[PDB]
Design a protein around this ligand. Structure first.
Ligand code: NAD
Ligand code: NAD
Lengths: 9, 331, 331, 9
């Protein structure tokens, strides 16, 4: 999708 | 003589006048703090009407000698130490259902302003940006996104959050919420996805919107740790309480690009300025000055209800005759 | 050799390249008018791709010698004399279904910006207005209105108007429309009130929104006569075509207070400026520069479809192989 | 309601 994965998960 | 009821942080009582004239003596203090309140009011006042601009700690409350009732003209009551007021015997009331749809309408406006860039495009056009070719349409409106298929995350599915959820469906938002206090079933009745942890909401939402009251456990809910759990280039909307978001963490996130844009009606320190505080010119920020609730009808509506709550206190029984008491358990 | 297809009013063909590489010679003119088009293109070109920034009259069209197909990258085709192109044997196509929901989302943003004053409150806050007391909240946000019970009037219930109608229901708008070309039944299927005349819509609507294509009979639809038929303090939204509203009449109405506020994405003369034209600083005006359609997905979507329409023209039969031809009757 | 009658009807 448009947004990417969180910086730290 | 008749009981004294004072408006603590205001100057206008025109709407309350016809409801209290015969049962109470009406005065006002126009005070930002408990310091500006006249000595007489602290001694004599039985009733109090207030907004959000004045905080009442335990210190302030035990200066009042005759105070028995505080009514907040509006929804949130975080600025009133409700536990402490209960210990002293002061009933605290609010007006919860006056500007529910006003707030949800302003919230949806904020969401859409971030997605469609309506405010920033107007700002660009104000500042003499010339847009001729299709190339420069795409350039000035760079970042404008398609709504259908996007995930809107709601933190706190109360009155406002519920109204936001219903409106969000129509745009094609995939709507999920996080609310650790609501019992099982609300998600099925309204046809919404529900997640059990704050991180789960943050992990899945492209746009995060705040609709929970400020309490003991949620101060700085969006901090340095939790901001990282949000998606890369996510939107943040906050029309709940300013004390819920770390403005230093938000600023840093906005500059770096981890949060693509933010829309704020509430801030940590009010009144808000684009010159004062941690949000000192962070890019892609839209701010309104605590005006999401406002409409003439809503303003009159809550003032009349608040005035009626005062009258119920003086004529009837505390806390029985009261309608919207929020500290029955502390009395 | 292979047929020449030119982009008339643009410079970018990166999205169309992979679809046309083997069937057509791709060039571009980056022209505002037919004057800037190279002599070669007028002689050789069989295909043409264009946007809204260039108008094609009958004069312009009969300079083309080999032109057989024009494809408009986008919805509206008022800037193309479709009747005249049919006489000469030039098929005209559009891309109708690429930015339907994008436009409806921007329109709803415009409606809400007028009702909740989100843009103007942000503008106020940008310009150093300090808002402390509740009194000055009501003052700076004066005119903010409750949505539920208000009547939204839609002129033209096509693709966009229909999507606006569905979204408007969720906010509590009472939705009625005027569309003299749709057959009986659409109002019942969608659950909307319908009126038979333009004046009837104008008489009943608190907020008027425009969603009809510019044609022979609707130029200056909102003029000096029809503006008077609008309610006192009504809102106007126009994301359809600029040639539909008399800007001189609108300006006068906005200053006097007969129209409380207007939101425009389209204008009579584009590019728009707050310094140039009849809207030269009229109060309560929000403007965006023809960007209601925009999103990266929509932009790519329509360009690929447009490129496919070109390919269908060169390989297959005119006007059979074509998908979205709008002048079959004029050929 | 909020809005008034048209200037000329
Ligand atoms: N911006 C404005 O002008 C304005 C206007 C109206 C309301 N507000 C604020 O926004 C809030 C809107 O809430 P409402 O009116 O729907 O009241 P509400 O009580 O109906 O909603 C609050 C809900 O949030 C939930 N909640 C509490 N703490 C939470 C947390 N830690 N995490 C997730 N959920 C939590 C509660 O279970 C509750 O159901 C109000 O509390 C008020 O402070 C601001
Ligand atoms: N602002 C933008 O960036 C942008 C984006 C998309 C569309 N548009 C414009 O807005 C319009 C949106 O329409 P659509 O995409 O739904 O196309 P559509 O054909 O589906 O809608 C047009 C409808 O309006 C009706 N109509 C025609 N003339 C009318 C009149 N005189 N009075 C009342 N109704 C009339 C027609 O019956 C038709 O059903 C387009 O024509 C386009 O020009 C602009």
């Amino acid at each position: 999708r448009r947004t990417g994965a969180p910086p730290a998960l | 003589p008749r009981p004294l009821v004072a408006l603590l942080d205001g100057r206008d009582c025109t709407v309350e006048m016809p409801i209290l004239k015969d049962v109470a003596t009406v005065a006002f203090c126009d005070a930002q703090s408990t310091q500006e309140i006249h000595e007489k009011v602290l001694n004599e006042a039985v009733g109090a009407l207030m907004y959000h601009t004045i905080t009442l700690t335990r210190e302030d409350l035990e200066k009042f000698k005759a105070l028995r009732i505080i009514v907040r003209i509006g929804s949130g009551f975080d600025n009133i130490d409700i536990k402490s007021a209960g210990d002293l015997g002061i009933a605290v009331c609010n007006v919860p259902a006056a500007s529910v749809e006003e707030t949800a309408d302003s919230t949806l406006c904020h969401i859409l302003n971030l997605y469609r860039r309506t405010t920033w495009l107007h700002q660009a056009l104000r500042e003499g940006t010339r847009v001729q070719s299709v190339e420069q349409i795409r350039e000035v409106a760079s970042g404008a996104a398609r709504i259908r298929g996007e995930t809107l995350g709601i933190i706190g599915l109360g009155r406002v959050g519920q109204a936001v959820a219903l409106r969000a469906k129509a745009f094609g938002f995939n709507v999920l919420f996080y609310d650790p206090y609501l019992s099982d079933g609300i998600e099925r009745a309204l046809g919404l996805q529900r997640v059990s942890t704050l991180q789960d909401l943050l992990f899945h939402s492209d746009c995060v919107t705040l609709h929970c009251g400020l309490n003991e456990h949620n101060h700085h809910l969006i901090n340095d740790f939790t901001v990282k759990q949000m998606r890369q280039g996510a939107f943040l909307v906050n029309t709940a309480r300013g004390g819920l978001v770390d403005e230093k963490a938000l600023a840093q996130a906005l500059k770096e690009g981890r949060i693509r844009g933010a829309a704020l009606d509430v801030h940590e320190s009010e009144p808000f300025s684009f010159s004062q505080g941690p949000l000192k010119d962070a890019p892609n920020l839209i701010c309104t000055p605590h005006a999401a609730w406002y409409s003439e009808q809503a303003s009159i509506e809550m003032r009349e209800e608040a005035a009626r709550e005062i009258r119920r206190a003086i004529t009837g029984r505390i806390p029985d005759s009261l309608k919207n008491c929020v500290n029955k358990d502390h009395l």
